[PDB]
Amino acid sequence: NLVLFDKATYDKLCKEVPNYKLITPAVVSERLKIRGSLARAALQELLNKGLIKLVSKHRAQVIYTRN
Amino acid sequence: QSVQVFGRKKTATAVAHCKRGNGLIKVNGRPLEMIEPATLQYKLLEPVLLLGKERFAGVDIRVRVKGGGHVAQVYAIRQAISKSLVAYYQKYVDEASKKEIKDILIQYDRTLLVADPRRCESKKFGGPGARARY
Amino acid sequence: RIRITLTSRNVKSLEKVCADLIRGAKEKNLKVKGPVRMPTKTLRITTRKTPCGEGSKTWDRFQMRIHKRLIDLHIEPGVEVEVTI
Amino acid sequence: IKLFGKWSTDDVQINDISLQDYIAVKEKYAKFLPHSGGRYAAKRFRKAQCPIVERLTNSLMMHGRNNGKKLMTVRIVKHAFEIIHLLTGENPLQVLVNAIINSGPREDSTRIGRQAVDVSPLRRVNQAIWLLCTGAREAAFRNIKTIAECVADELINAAKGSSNSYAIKKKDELERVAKSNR
Amino acid sequence: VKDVNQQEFVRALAAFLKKSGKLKVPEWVDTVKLAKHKELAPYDENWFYTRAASTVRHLYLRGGAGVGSMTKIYGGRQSNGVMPSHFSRGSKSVARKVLQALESLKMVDKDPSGGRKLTPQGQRDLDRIAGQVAAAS
Amino acid sequence: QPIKLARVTKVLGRTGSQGQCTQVRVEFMDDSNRSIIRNVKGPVREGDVLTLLESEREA
RNA sequence: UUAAUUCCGAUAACGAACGAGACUCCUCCAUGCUAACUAGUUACGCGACCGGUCGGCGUAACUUCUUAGAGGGACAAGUGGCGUUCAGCCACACGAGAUCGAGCAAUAACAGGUCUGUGAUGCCCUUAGAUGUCCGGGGCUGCACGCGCGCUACACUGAACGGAUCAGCGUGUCCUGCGCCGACAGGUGCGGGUAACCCGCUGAACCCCGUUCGUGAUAGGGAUCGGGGAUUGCAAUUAUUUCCCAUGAACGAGGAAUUCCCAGUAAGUGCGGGUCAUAAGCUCGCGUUGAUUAAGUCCCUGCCCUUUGUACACACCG
Numbered sequence: 002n003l004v005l006f007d008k009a010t011y012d013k014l015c016k017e018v019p020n021y022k023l024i025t026p027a028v029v030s031e032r033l034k035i036r037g038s039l040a041r042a043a044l045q046e047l048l049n050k051g052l053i054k055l056v057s058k059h060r061a062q063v064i065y066t067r068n
Numbered sequence: 069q070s071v072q073v074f075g076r077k078k079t080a081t082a083v084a085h086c087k088r089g090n091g092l093i094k095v096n097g098r099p100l101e102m103i104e105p106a107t108l109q110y111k112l113l114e115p116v117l118l119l120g121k122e123r124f125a126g127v128d129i130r131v132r133v134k135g136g137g138h139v140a141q142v143y144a145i146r147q148a149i150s151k152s153l154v155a156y157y158q159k160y161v162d163e164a165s166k167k168e169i170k171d172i173l174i175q176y177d178r179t180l181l182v183a184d185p186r187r188c189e190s191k192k193f194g195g196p197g198a199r200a201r202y
Numbered sequence: 203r204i205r206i207t208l209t210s211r212n213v214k215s216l217e218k219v220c221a222d223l224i225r226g227a228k229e230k231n232l233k234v235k236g237p238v239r240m241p242t243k244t245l246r247i248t249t250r251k252t253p254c255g256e257g258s259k260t261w262d263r264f265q266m267r268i269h270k271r272l273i274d275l276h277i278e279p280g281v282e283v284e285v286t287i
Numbered sequence: 288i289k290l291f292g293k294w295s296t297d298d299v300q301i302n303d304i305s306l307q308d309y310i311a312v313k314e315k316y317a318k319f320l321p322h323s324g325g326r327y328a329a330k331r332f333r334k335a336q337c338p339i340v341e342r343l344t345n346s347l348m349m350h351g352r353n354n355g356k357k358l359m360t361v362r363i364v365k366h367a368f369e370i371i372h373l374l375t376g377e378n379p380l381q382v383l384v385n386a387i388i389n390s391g392p393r394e395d396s397t398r399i400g401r402q403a404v405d406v407s408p409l410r411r412v413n414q415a416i417w418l419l420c421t422g423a424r425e426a427a428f429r430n431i432k433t434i435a436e437c438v439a440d441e442l443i444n445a446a447k448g449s450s451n452s453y454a455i456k457k458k459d460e461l462e463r464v465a466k467s468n469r
Numbered sequence: 470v471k472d473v474n475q476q477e478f479v480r481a482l483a484a485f486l487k488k489s490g491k492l493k494v495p496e497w498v499d500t501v502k503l504a505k506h507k508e509l510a511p512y513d514e515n516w517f518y519t520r521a522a523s524t525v526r527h528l529y530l531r532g533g534a535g536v537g538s539m540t541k542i543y544g545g546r547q548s549n550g551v552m553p554s555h556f557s558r559g560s561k562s563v564a565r566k567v568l569q570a571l572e573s574l575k576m577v578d579k580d581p582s583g584g585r586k587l588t589p590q591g592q593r594d595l596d597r598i599a600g601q602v603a604a605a606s
Numbered sequence: 607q608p609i610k611l612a613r614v615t616k617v618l619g620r621t622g623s624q625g626q627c628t629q630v631r632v633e634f635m636d637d638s639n640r641s642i643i644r645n646v647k648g649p650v651r652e653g654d655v656l657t658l659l660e661s662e663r664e665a
Numbered sequence: 666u667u668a669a670u671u672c673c674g675a676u677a678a679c680g681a682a683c684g685a686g687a688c689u690c691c692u693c694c695a696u697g698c699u700a701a702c703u704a705g706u707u708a709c710g711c712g713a714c715c716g717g718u719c720g721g722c723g724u725a726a727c728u729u730c731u732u733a734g735a736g737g738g739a740c741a742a743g744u745g746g747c748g749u750u751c752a753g754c755c756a757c758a759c760g761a762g763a764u765c766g767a768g769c770a771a772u773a774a775c776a777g778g779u780c781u782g783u784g785a786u787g788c789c790c791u792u793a794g795a796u797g798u799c800c801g802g803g804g805c806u807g808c809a810c811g812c813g814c815g816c817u818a819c820a821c822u823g824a825a826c827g828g829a830u831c832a833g834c835g836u837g838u839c840c841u842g843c844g845c846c847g848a849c850a851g852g853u854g855c856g857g858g859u860a861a862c863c864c865g866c867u868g869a870a871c872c873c874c875g876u877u878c879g880u881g882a883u884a885g886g887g888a889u890c891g892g893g894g895a896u897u898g899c900a901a902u903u904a905u906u907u908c909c910c911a912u913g914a915a916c917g918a919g920g921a922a923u924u925c926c927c928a929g930u931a932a933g934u935g936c937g938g939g940u941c942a943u944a945a946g947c948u949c950g951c952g953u954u955g956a957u958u959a960a961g962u963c964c965c966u967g968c969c970c971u972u973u974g975u976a977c978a979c980a981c982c983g
Contacts, residue, residue: 002881022374027431027821030879037431037821037879056373060875061821062366062435066373072706072729073696078929079832079952083730085707097718098471104830105873107358107365110292110319117319132706132730137953138831138872139358143324155696177323182761184326185693186929188833190766191950193248193261198766199930202259202814217734236700239733241861246835248939248949256778261949263768265690269733270861272703304611305655324955328928331960332651345956353822354932355954358872363822393609393657395647397627400964402645402665404627405656410648417957427822429917431879434822462659469660471718476828476874501848503827505908509884512826512877519827531720531868535843542868546935550887551817552946556869556935562847584843586721589713596715625962649959 003035006043010035014043019052024065071155075147076183080136082144084129086152088160091121092128095145108142115150115180118172127156143179150180203287206273210281213269219281220271233276240270289317291340291380294368299380302388305408310384311338322361335409339383339416340364346420347438363434370439385446390415390454394465403469415454419445422453470529470595473602481605482522482598487515493570494518506547506557521567525576528587529595535584539564610661611635612644614654621645632656 003010010033018029030040044065047053056064070087082095093100093116100112110117116124131148133141150173157166173180189198196202206223210216220237227234245266251257277283289296296317301307321340327333334342347353347360368379375382391411396403406414423437430437444452450459470478486492494517502510503520513519524539534542540558547557568585571577576591587595612632621629628650633641635655642664646656 023370023436025370025433025436027433027436027879030431035879036881038877040879041877057366057369058875059362059366060873061823062362062433064366064369064373064435070707071696074730076694081730083706085729087707092717094717102472102474104475105358107361107873108320108322111322114319133831134730134866135952136832139954141831177318177325179323179325183693184929185761185765186326187692187765188929188952190691192767193949194259195925197926197931199927200925200932202925213734220734237734238701238703240703241732244835246938246950252778253782254779259948263949271733272701274701303657305657308655324929326928328930328956328958331649334958342957347822348932348956350822351932352820354956355934356822356872357955359822362873394659397622397645397647400623404645404647405632405658407628407646407648407650408654408656409650411657413648413958424822429820429880431821466659469663474874475830479828480875497848505849508825510826516827523828527868529719531866533720533843534868536845537842538868544869546870548887549817549946553816554870554935560849561851562849565845579844582843587713592714592719596718600715620961623962623964625964628961649961 003033004039006035006039015047015052018044019047019067021067024053024067026063069160071152071159073148073152073155075144075149075151077136077140077144077147078187080133080140080144082131082133082141082148084131084145084148084152086149086156087128087130088126089128091125092130093124093149094129095131096133097130100145103142103145105138105142108139111142112146112149114146114176115153115173118176119153119169123153123169127153129153147180147183154181204275205286206275207284207286208271208273208281209284210269211267212280215278216269216271216281219278219283220273223273227275235274237271237273240272243268243270290319291365291368292319294372294379296380299378299384301384303391306387306391306412309335309408309412310387311336312340312380312384320361321364322357332409334413339387339412340380342412342416343383343420346416347424347434349420349424363438366435367438367442370435371442374439374443382442382446386419386442386452386454387412387415388446389448390418390445390452390458392458392461394469395461396465396468401464401468403465415458418454418457419452422457425453470526470599473599473606475526477602477606478599479519479523479526481602482526482595483515483518485594485598486522487518489574491574492518492521493566493573495566501560501563503543503563504545504557504559506545508548517567517570520563521570524564524567525571525587525591525595528571528577528585529592532586533580533583535580536561536565536568538584539568607660607662610658612642612656612658612661614646614650614652614656615641617650617652618643630656632658634661 006014014029014033018024018033021028024044026037026041026044029035029044030037033040035043041063044053044063048055048065052068053065054068056066058064070085072083072085074081074083076082095103095112100116101109103109103112129149129152131145133145135141136144154166154169154173157169170181191198194201208216208220208223217237224234224237245264245268247264247266248261249264251260251262296313299312301310301312316336316338318338318341321338321344323338323341325337327337344357344360344364347363348356353359371379371382392406392414393411394403395406419441420438423434423441426432426437426441427434441452441454443449445454448455450456498517500510502508503516511519520543527539527542528534531538540561543559543564544557545559546554548554568577571591572585574591576588576594577585578588580586611634613635614630615633616631618629618631621627627645627647629643630646630650631641631643632646633639640661642661644656644658645665
């Protein structure tokens with residue numbers, strides 16, 4: 002639903018999502034109430050920093066995990 | 069010292085040129101792990117993963133494929149490579165090493181050395197395909 | 203060099219004149235190339251059986267096979283012969 | 288060692304002695320991919336020798352849109368086992384075989400023109416895979432949740448009896464009908 | 470150009486073809502869509518570099534292609550709305566202008582028998598990029 | 607009552623209006639006794655192991 | 666018992682005929698023959714690139730791949746079990762296969778279709794102000810509606826954008842290749858092929874790999890309309906088709922009912938042929954991807970047979 006992050010939502014992404022078992026642009030979009038476009042690009046930033054890892058990347062399936 | 073064995077899927081005819089040398093396995097000049105369908109990459113590596121690379125480390129294999137589809141060529145390449153090594157171990161190596169290779173490839177999947185005769189059936193009038201009707 | 207093309211609708215009569223051509227020319231000490239068998243052509247005609255529109259969509263398939271064999275050297279009814287240079 | 292590539296085929300035990308013969312996993316039907324095309328639809332009991340990872344792949348091609356698209360469903364099962372191994376540290380092959388154990392109706396009812404009857408060991412695994420793939424398919428018809436996630440959640444809930452799996456709710460529904468019509 | 474992945478090959482060859490700022494890149498690259506069966510223009514801004522990298526790669530594998538062949542290579546399915554979809558050839562002017570652009574770089578010349586083939590210079594440049602993608606993998 | 611585990615020994619025939627249920631004489635594995643007859647739905651052959659939820663009535 | 670009045674067996678019947686089967690064309694192999702500059706492989710030289718690639722060029726070996734002739738091969742043959750230990754069935758080993766797909770198809774029937782397929786045809790009718798025949802224009806396309814075959818959808822198992830990568834059937838005096846022009850549809854010059862030669866290594870689509878889209882009537886769906894560019898033809902208005910821009914409707918798996926289908930099958934996917942000056946949402950074929958379930962039953966619905974009844978025999982439309 003949400004298209005652009007907010008101060009209450011962006012901080013919610015950076016503190017508890019890297020602690021999830023399954024990190025996917027679909028599972029983080031349902032609980033953060035954000036759209037898949039923002040959820041997909043947001044997880045790419047956490048992958049570059051190092052908070053999350055990458056299990057397997059594909060066209061319509063990108064699977065992240067925790068360090 | 070080389071053999072030329074063909075593997076046939078529905079319409080995919082893959083001919084492997086098993087010739088002595090190093091461990092070279094190429095399909096139409098491209099390496100075996102470079103074929104476009106990556107999902108079926110393990111199907112092409114079954115003759116190598118089962119028999120081990122030490123059996124292929126003395127023969128070069130250059131497969132030429134034409135006909136059929138993407139999946140048909142996959143099963144035809146792995147069949148040509150499976151039978152080219154068997155036919156090589158039969159004419160230039162002892163027969164005991166041939167049975168040592170056949171029993172490994174047959175017990176896993178018989179389609180590596182025996183082609184299945186399944187072909188598309190002719191369409192009948194009054195229906196969209198072979199069996200189905202209007 | 204002469205290339206003899208042989209086209210017929212029946213393989214028995216086509217290979218009968220083909221064997222007599224090779225055998226008839228081999229006794230003359232003429233180096234001949236073997237009979238090259240061209241891929242057969244099937245003239246497909248799928249028509250409607252009924253002369254009206256009441257049939258149960260029953261079609262009849264016809265075939266007219268034309269076998270072609272060429273002989274390169276250095277006749278029965280139904281067989282066409284054409285020599286070249 | 289024979290594996291799917293990362294997931295081992297051994298250490299996969301079967302609890303039910305009935306389904307132990309009709310589930311092809313260990314030491315004889317272990318292949319790198321759930322795609323062999325071994326003409327299992329030829330004789331009466333040839334599908335019993337087909338690996339359940341390929342039968343799970345064949346049952347995911349259930350719609351006019353997905354017919355004749357198996358390399359997709361192989362990728363779906365490949366990605367589903369990634370999510371299964373990620374959510375639960377156990378072997379994904381163990382989760383699939385445990386899902387069939389809990390998604391197999393032991394008894395069913397037949398219509399008389401009801402009457403409770405037994406269920407063959409082959410129909411259990413036949414219906415378990417049918418109920419599992421049907422639940423993951425309906426869970427992703429209109430949802431941002433991908434199919435690899437729905438298949439993974441359908442299998443982890445069935446392997447645990449969480450009563451949230453579409454297969455478990457249907458398996459218990461068919462049994463309670465036969466319990467009252469016996 | 471073989472022995473490496475062909476999808477990352479055309480992406481690295483296009484980067485080399487763009488960093489070497491000598492390609493033609495006609496003025497209408499922003500308005501045209503690459504085929505009549507396409508609904509939208511290419512999402513990538515530098516589609517002329519991506520197609521040129523892929524076109525010269527097809528000439529390495531099958532020389533003497535020409536404009537009519539590259540039109541068939543880059544063809545695809547054509548949705549006809551409520552009517553069944555058929556195959557549709559690509560754009561002829563896009564395939565022709567991208568062939569002449571490769572000729573300005575001396576990588577493609579007119580084939581004596583048919584259309585256009587690859588030059589020894591283009592065969593060298595393609596093998597250099599084919600070595601970079603192998604070392605970077 | 608426990609869930610009894612029986613093994614198929616002999617396939618008798620097909621029962622039901624449309625022949626969907628197979629009549630099978632299924633004996634128990636804990637002991638050679640109790641060679642009961644059951645109606646099974648699905649493909650059954652000699653040697654199958656059935657999971658009898660209720661084993662009192664024969665039917 | 667069998668797909669089968671197919672067989673065994675019972676036996677006032679015995680021996681046979683048509684149909685079934687056999688047969689014909691098909692695909693499955695046969696590194697064994699016969700041969701291939703209109704098919705190829707391999708070894709070679711040649712040469713481009715950094716021993717690997719080359720459908721990049723050349724004529725000596727010979728047939729694996731390709732083509733097609735001949736001859737082989739499979740017959741419930743072998744094993745186990747079930748059976749009048751018969752006819753056969755089931756399960757296995759071996760093996761390219763252990764019910765492959767057409768064609769042909771008896772006796773006899775329909776008041777089944779066809780006079781609009783015939784210079785097949787009886788009769789009737791119209792015969793020159795014609796129901797002959799030609800040339801114009803219109804119609805068969807007309808639309809409150811009730812149905813029957815279909816296509817496209819209702820998506821994320823997806824649309825798009827881009828990358829990569831594979832067919833077969835077949836047609837060609839029209840099929841089409843290259844160099845130019847154009848955004849596309851087109852145009853234009855030079856060419857090849859009456860064809861295993863040219864199109865053509867048929868670079869098909871689905872599919873595969875990236876890339877954005879993110880319950881959303883939405884980048885699903887492309888129906889309905891506007892404004893233009895072309896092509897076909899003597900001529901498109903009631904838009905022949907085609908392209909471009911714009912317009913963005915119903916449709917969130919569908920009531921009672923109902924259809925098709927058992928393995929390379931259903932379904933998805935595209936191609937070719939027929940129609941064709943212009944030409945596929947149809948149909949006849951082709952390959953591609955490729956299953957779920959079932960190896961069973963008279964429950965339904967269809968026919969068949971036996972028995973039974975008949976005042977029916979133009980045969981219950983009696």
